[PDB]
Amino acid sequence: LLKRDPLNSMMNIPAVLSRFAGKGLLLSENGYLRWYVASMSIGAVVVLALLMVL
Amino acid sequence: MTITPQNLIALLPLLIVGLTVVVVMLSIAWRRNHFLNATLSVIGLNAALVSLWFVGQAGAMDVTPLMRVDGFAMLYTGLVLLASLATCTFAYPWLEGYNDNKDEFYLLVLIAALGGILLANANHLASLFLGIELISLPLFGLVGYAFRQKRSLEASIKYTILSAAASSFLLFGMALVYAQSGDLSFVALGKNLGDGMLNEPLLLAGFGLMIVGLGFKLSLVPFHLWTPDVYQGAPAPVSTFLATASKIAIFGVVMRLFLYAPVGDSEAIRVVLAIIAFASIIFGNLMALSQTNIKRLLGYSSISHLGYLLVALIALQTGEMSMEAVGVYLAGYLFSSLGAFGVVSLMSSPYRGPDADSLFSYRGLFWHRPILAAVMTVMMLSLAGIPMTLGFIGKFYVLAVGVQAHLWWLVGAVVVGSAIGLYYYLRVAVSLYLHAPEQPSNWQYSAGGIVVLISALLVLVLGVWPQPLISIVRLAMPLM
Amino acid sequence: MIPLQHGLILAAILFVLGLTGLVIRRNLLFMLIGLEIMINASALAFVVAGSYWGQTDGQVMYILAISLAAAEASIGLALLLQLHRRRQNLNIDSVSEMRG
Amino acid sequence: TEVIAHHWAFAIFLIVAIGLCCLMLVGGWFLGGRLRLSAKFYLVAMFFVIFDVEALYLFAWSTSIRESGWVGFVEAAIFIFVLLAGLVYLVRIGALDWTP
Amino acid sequence: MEFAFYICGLIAILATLRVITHTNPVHALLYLIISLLAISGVFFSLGAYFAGALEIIVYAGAIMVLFVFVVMMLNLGGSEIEQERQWLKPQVWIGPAILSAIMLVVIVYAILGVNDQGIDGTPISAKAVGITLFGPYVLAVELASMLLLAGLVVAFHVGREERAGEVLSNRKDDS
């Protein structure tokens, strides 16, 4: 039952999570300039909202 | 206030760079020569460095309400000047095989060096705005210098539009903080407030819009989406310049703004930059994982390194050594990125026309040019926070600053981001030593070679012995 | 007579409309037009801020703003001309060859 | 009690000038029963724009010529020297001649 | 001069609103011209005579000139883009508009909470701008001259013809 290493698997699911998060985050780099301006506006909204909340 | 004759001594590097700008332009008009203009630009930057030494012989004073010259300004002026020198020495072999005019590149590099010096000396909001715009606007024609090529033109388009948008954001935020506080100086942005009134809405929102603009200019999250396309599309000396000198000057003016203004005691801007630094480190190290192109990977690495700068900046009001840590990490990052982009520029030289695709293919680089592979893997070790390199000294300073003021989340973010980063750093380092599936005698190519190997010797020496760097950084202390 | 809030709200509304026209439109020329709208909005906000305190720094910042607007308009229009001469279209979603 | 009359005179002058042009146009109306131009035109327009914005600094210099001493004259002189260096660079490269 | 300021602001907002949601670009540029005229009137109403005179001299007398010069040069009417009519579709229209309107409401919430001393009189003429333009702010105009020189160099290097002819039909990738 242990010959397929369970603890090595549970210790390299951080690598799987990192690869999944990198592949998910690379969808934002689609190369569209309009989405770049939209993301700039989204970040500005987020920064202003976080400043007004605090 | 008026400018005295003795105040002209502290102005000297800026005057020398402007004089070499007009001298280079007159030489272009008279002759239109490549080697003469490159030599004039190099001589002007070297004379600006000797002028910086002359400034160090003189005092440290406020020249105008726009500019105050001190050790911080001298250090950042020197870093920007040597980065511009490296850009010129990497750009001459690239421009040797260029079909169109090849002197406006040096003119724009000199003007952007002037903008970086202005940002280094910037003690004012107008000075900050003018400095970042003097950095941004020559870089438009620097990125789109190979506008015959498709990707360079696209990168120039993206950079121009997003920089205009972020300049509008910064200008509106600066207008808001001018409407709130009736002085445009750095030191008088919250002097009219007190007794816990400092968290006012207008000043905070204006500083948020300024944070948006400067986070575009420092490739922070989520304003970092311009970074890989601009790094890839632009020519490799342009990528070198807009990675090292532009970002060094913008972070220097950001540090001076957050040090001199009394909004550093505000516990909302600090939390916003903590979130931004956390997300910048984590996100940049995440999207640099599955990258095959070296320029996009270096762009995400730059995103992570400005994240490390930002966490070094958060503890500025408490750690008491944050300026020294930022200076040391910027010296290490400047030399490491200079060496890496110098290898990129030397291997992608000359231009070889716009029809041929300018892919790098770093695999098998050791089997035809071993010295370039050696300096490239030295810089790849340096960017990972790995010892016997100066990048480890900078990472140690950043971690000490983060753990001195008890930034546990940010320290954990730095540790996780470095552990993620060394994966692709050593992947590139191994891949440049593997077997190539498929597959230089000039004086200036050799000049770029000694420049990159001098950078390699510098990072190795200051990794095994960083004490002269600490001595020359601590000697350059701003006036509190 | 005129409160600062109304002028700053007018400048903010112009900035919002310029950003909206910059995002929602695919044409590069209209994108540059929206960029100049946001630049003029920030310049107007600086003018109101300078006129409120009675200082002349707002008008100097307006001069710097319109100098930046002039040079950036020149650069963006040169890039627009090159994009038309090469791609023969001005769709900003068409020039997206750089994937992640 | 004089500048209000002057502003009123300016207002009626503008209003009745546009009204005269409108009534003149509608009285004329009532009675009776893929290519590209060039790039040098854009270049000369951009020369006009950049030199007009530098002329703006000369515009603002001309009003405060006496209140600023010889140091202001030196600063405007090196400004004009940079302007003329740019203009003579433009002259000598060949981008300013037409040659149709 | 307060009702003039309010009406100039209202027609400036209206003119730029017709700028944003227009179809052919020359009418949008005309609407931006009258919007810049209205913002110049706003500048005049607040005592910034130099600012409004500058807006019509520079922003409306040179910059809109460059925009209409390019438009009238390369002969766009918005061809192949008017017939698509992407901006007058709602699934693209709600998103950025409500996002940037959330930005609008949060930034005008940040506008309020500041003490109101009002816009005073004492119109700042060009003499004050001159005496503070070559006093404390010398390096501003010197390095702004350098910045304009850099912008001229960038746009000239990017956007010249490289071909001979005062009438040119469009070739792909310039022959």
From Swiss-Prot, chain C:
GO terms for molecular function: NADH:ubiquinone reductase (non-electrogenic) activity; quinone binding. The keyword Manganese does not apply. It catalyses: a quinone + NADH + 5 H(+)(in) = a quinol + NAD(+) + 4 H(+)(out). It is found in: Cell inner membrane. It comes from the Bacteria. Keywords: Cell inner membrane, Cell membrane, Membrane, NAD, Quinone, Translocase, Transmembrane, Transmembrane helix, Transport, Ubiquinone. It is a multi-pass membrane protein. One of its GO terms (cellular component) is NADH dehydrogenase complex. It holds the Pfam family Oxidored_q2. NDH-1 is composed of 13 different subunits. Subunits NuoA, H, J, K, L, M, N constitute the membrane sector of the complex. This is NADH-quinone oxidoreductase subunit K. It comes from Escherichia coli (strain B / BL21-DE3). The lineage of its organism: Bacteria, Pseudomonadati, Pseudomonadota, Gammaproteobacteria, Enterobacterales. The gene is nuoK.
